[PDB]
Design a protein around this ligand. Structure first.
Ligand SMILES: COc1ccc(C2(C(=O)O)CCOCC2)cc1
Length: 191
């Protein structure tokens, strides 16, 4: 999680898309969706990012509709944005035990139990928190079984990005679970 305000420069694809849906939260604008292999993904926009400006206009108090409107009108050639990185999220680094567990239980992405004397317990993992990312890979909308698989196929060191469940549930309001499963970018980021 980068701790300040960064600039990104986007270019609409051939179809006039940038691969983004935005959501009004708390009189700010936040990324709700980033499409796989989109301009948004390529420049490193992530679920939960806060859009502070689009082409030098403040996003404060915009509706989701106005934000999507503003992206439609923009000259495709070059869109600038100012971004706060995942400001509602935090990162937690854990170490797997000899049996391959970081030490928590979760249901529909939300951590529900912390196991006594686990890495999760020592690193202060919290319940009623939704898993957004595992080792920088977005897992939002993936089945519980696949999130377990991605945890099992990570090394002994597991970084998990988490969001308070209330906040997460407010952000994904009005996005179909199939769009999340199907289109939400879940690739290991390119270099
Ligand atoms: C007393 O507080 C702590 C905090 C972290 C740990 C480690 C972990 O499990 O993450 C131990 C193994 O290596 C990494 C760190 C241990 C004790």
């Amino acid at each position: 999680i980068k701790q300040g305000i960064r600039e990104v420069i986007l270019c609409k694809d051939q179809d006039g898309k940038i691969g983004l849906r935005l959501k009004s939260i708390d009189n700010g604008i936040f990324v709700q969706l980033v499409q796989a292999n989109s301009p948004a993904s390529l420049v490193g926009l992530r679920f939960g990012d806060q859009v502070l400006q689009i082409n030098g206009e403040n996003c404060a108090g915009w509706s989701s509709d106005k934000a999507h409107k503003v992206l439609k009108q923009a000259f495709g050639e070059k869109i600038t944005m100012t971004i706060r990185d995942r400001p509602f999220e935090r990162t937690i680094t854990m170490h797997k035990d000899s049996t391959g567990h970081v030490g928590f239980i979760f249901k529909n992405g939300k951590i529900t139990s912390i196991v006594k004397d686990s890495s999760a317990a020592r690193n202060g993992l919290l319940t009623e928190h939704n898993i957004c990312e595992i080792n920088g890979q977005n897992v939002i909308g993936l089945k519980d079984s696949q999130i377990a698989d991605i945890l099992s196929t990570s090394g002994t060191v597991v970084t998990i990005t988490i969001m308070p469940a209330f906040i997460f549930e407010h952000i994904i309001k009005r996005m179909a679970p199939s769009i999340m499963k199907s289109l939400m970018d879940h690739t290991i980021p390119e270099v």
